[PDB]
Symmetry: D3
Subunit: 128 residues, 6 copies
Amino acid sequence: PTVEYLNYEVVDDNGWDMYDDDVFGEASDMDLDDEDYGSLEVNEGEYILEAAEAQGYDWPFSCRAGACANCAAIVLEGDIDMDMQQILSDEEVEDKNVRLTCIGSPDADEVKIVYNAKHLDYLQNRVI
Amino acid sequence: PTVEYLNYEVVDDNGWDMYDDDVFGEASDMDLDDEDYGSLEVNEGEYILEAAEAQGYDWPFSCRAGACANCAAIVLEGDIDMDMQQILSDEEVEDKNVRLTCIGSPDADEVKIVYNAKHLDYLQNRVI
Amino acid sequence: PTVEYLNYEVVDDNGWDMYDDDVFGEASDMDLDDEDYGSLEVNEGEYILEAAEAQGYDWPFSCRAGACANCAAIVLEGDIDMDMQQILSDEEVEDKNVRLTCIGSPDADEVKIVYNAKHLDYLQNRVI
Amino acid sequence: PTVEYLNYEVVDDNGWDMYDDDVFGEASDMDLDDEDYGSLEVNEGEYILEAAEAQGYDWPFSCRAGACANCAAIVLEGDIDMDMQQILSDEEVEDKNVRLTCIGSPDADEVKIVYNAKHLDYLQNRVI
Amino acid sequence: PTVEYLNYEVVDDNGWDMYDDDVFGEASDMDLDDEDYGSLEVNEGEYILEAAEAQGYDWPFSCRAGACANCAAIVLEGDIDMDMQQILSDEEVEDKNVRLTCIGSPDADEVKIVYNAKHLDYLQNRVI
Amino acid sequence: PTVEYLNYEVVDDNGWDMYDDDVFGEASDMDLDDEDYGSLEVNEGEYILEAAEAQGYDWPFSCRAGACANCAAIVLEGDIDMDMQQILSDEEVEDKNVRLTCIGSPDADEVKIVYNAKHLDYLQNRVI
Ligand code: FES
Ligand code: FES
Ligand code: FES
Ligand code: FES
Ligand code: FES
Ligand code: FES
Ligand SMILES: [K+]
Ligand SMILES: [K+]
Ligand SMILES: [K+]
Ligand SMILES: [K+]
Ligand SMILES: [K+]
Ligand SMILES: [K+]
Ligand SMILES: [K+]
Ligand SMILES: [K+]
Ligand SMILES: [K+]
Ligand SMILES: [K+]
Ligand SMILES: [K+]
Ligand SMILES: [K+]
Ligand SMILES: [K+]
Ligand SMILES: [K+]
Ligand SMILES: [K+]
Ligand SMILES: [K+]
Ligand SMILES: [K+]
Ligand SMILES: [K+]
Ligand SMILES: [K+]
Ligand SMILES: [K+]
Ligand SMILES: [K+]
Ligand SMILES: [K+]
Ligand SMILES: [K+]
Ligand SMILES: [K+]
Ligand SMILES: [K+]
Ligand SMILES: [K+]
Ligand SMILES: [K+]
Ligand SMILES: [K+]
Ligand SMILES: [K+]
Ligand SMILES: [K+]
Ligand SMILES: [K+]
Ligand SMILES: [K+]
Ligand SMILES: [K+]
Ligand SMILES: [K+]
Ligand SMILES: [K+]
Ligand SMILES: [K+]
């Protein structure tokens, strides 16, 4: 699969809303470092965080076990299949689109995420 | 959580349909062995197959890795959270309600399943 | 289970001895942050460190594999069941009550620990 | 470590009691197959079942996850360190000396077990 | 990757030698069941046994942990990357081309194996 | 096994070449801290990084999953058997002798490594 990704700090510095602004289009016209914006090839069954790390991208994580929110990302297009986790609520998964990249792989041919979503205020209570 | 379970072979011997017949009510009036019908306490985060095995229930499995259909169950009420798996399609998960018990835990306080769902014909192609 | 916990740095700043002082009673009259003193609900089979992290508590760890002492805690009441580990001696487990929280779950309904026990001098040689 | 082992079916066929009879001495004068009596070299940290399997010994197991009793053994001398497990009670571990070989390694230089202890009647309720 | 595979029992029934006979060409002119001869798509990082099982192929395995020889295959073209294992010798890996399919993934775009190689006499001592 | 190890920063500060200089002999005449030069006993099947950490050596790592280069070491004598990994090329493994210590164990009775090899320029692109 292809996961296009945008570091949440770029969304936050610009005052963008990940559903009203053309976050991926506008970050492609900037000159962000590759770990902050780009597209990543990720096999089905391959963890997104580990595909990012194998490109040398030091995306956030702490536990690597679905027991924190440090690796959270928001999926804007496509889907990410996760291992079992009890930290995110059903509403955070189904409506807020929070996925944990340490334990999630692409579930669609094309996925688009805003990673580093640990800075979202509702997730700050599970960030270690 | 409590997972009430019914072995699919009882549904199949009786010609029941798991959505039109009172499968759990009618199996409670029979005298099935406890591994074939009952309710199981399963912790959040605890695999349903392993909670069944720790009661001495030898529910079906082969791979234990989300790479076959031998541990499939159909969830009729509540939900089961699974580890990442590529063997079941989105339609099998979202519409047919197939969950793999070797890698799935209860995702709700009350869950009801028809286990041993590996005998369903559409899953016979992934049964090893 | 319920694990009541006290960060070892509070015991050490106060010159308390974890077996002569009323360490939990006295920390309950202070105004410590919740990660430093409180009670945690932890399922049987659930790692104590991961239950702490899912509350947003950034308790110490490095390896997460029972190969260091950074996640050590001293269990004062109840018990913690650990995965296999060769780093702690029998005397450290049976007499000094050292448990590794990254690989240990509650083994009793009520457990009381002094976590962050990596600062104990006899464990400083295995702290990374 | 060295784990000397005796298949429980030899103890049971002979009417021996694993604490009054010279079970290892008497099985050494028989002509059992090597998987039924012998001594096994097992590294610290190496699972006893997997050291037996790498000698081609097909010792019993089902789940390999500490969720059944099929791999049980009784440790008569030395000790076996296990991963976390909730299936055995404290009394079964501390007084009856039940260890699960799929998730246990030697915890002493010399260990002696009676494997295939799944045939003990008090464990028959967790045998799958 | 593509792994073309041939069940070793076909090689053995025909008196073929996996290095002098056109084992894959000749099995393609037979009418073997798909689990006995075919080509399998296997992701890098995906275990060959689990890719076979997800096609419903019940290829041999016992331990799934690199502690037996039941899942052995001989790689004739390309390579399979394995997890750490101590059961096979260097000569069995480098010269006899034995790979354990439960813990090995394709290491080349095109791989060709003769699976079910547990029937080879030199591996019979580690078959459980 | 015995793994003799030398921190790559000592090789780099001295302008040594790990194949022309007597890197281990010359570091033995210095007064490096034990984590920077010494010999480590590591069981077959035991990860080298975890054997180092259990001596209190805080050797580099990030992912612990074979998805980065932070734990790289160069093996100068003997060999290290690794779990499956897709981050290193065949040439990096076979010719440059790069091994990932988080997922590698000794594959020979005597092994000699230059750890902390993440500072090598060709590996800097996979260092997180
Ligand atoms: S790093 Fe904690 S859940 Fe992903
Ligand atoms: S036993 Fe194969 S997926 Fe559960
Ligand atoms: S963090 Fe190292 S043993 Fe727990
Ligand atoms: S085989 Fe089930 S606990 Fe060991
Ligand atoms: S099934 Fe035992 S090593 Fe693969
Ligand atoms: S720490 Fe990343 S591969 Fe070893
Ligand atoms: K694509
Ligand atoms: K802002
Ligand atoms: K750009
Ligand atoms: K993220
Ligand atoms: K969940
Ligand atoms: K949504
Ligand atoms: K309930
Ligand atoms: K029928
Ligand atoms: K009944
Ligand atoms: K089932
Ligand atoms: K999926
Ligand atoms: K549905
Ligand atoms: K309680
Ligand atoms: K002090
Ligand atoms: K207080
Ligand atoms: K701790
Ligand atoms: K131990
Ligand atoms: K004690
Ligand atoms: K010995
Ligand atoms: K008898
Ligand atoms: K004999
Ligand atoms: K046993
Ligand atoms: K226990
Ligand atoms: K005892
Ligand atoms: K191909
Ligand atoms: K033949
Ligand atoms: K054919
Ligand atoms: K095979
Ligand atoms: K090896
Ligand atoms: K060869
Ligand atoms: K040696
Ligand atoms: K230099
Ligand atoms: K010295
Ligand atoms: K290293
Ligand atoms: K590789
Ligand atoms: K070389």
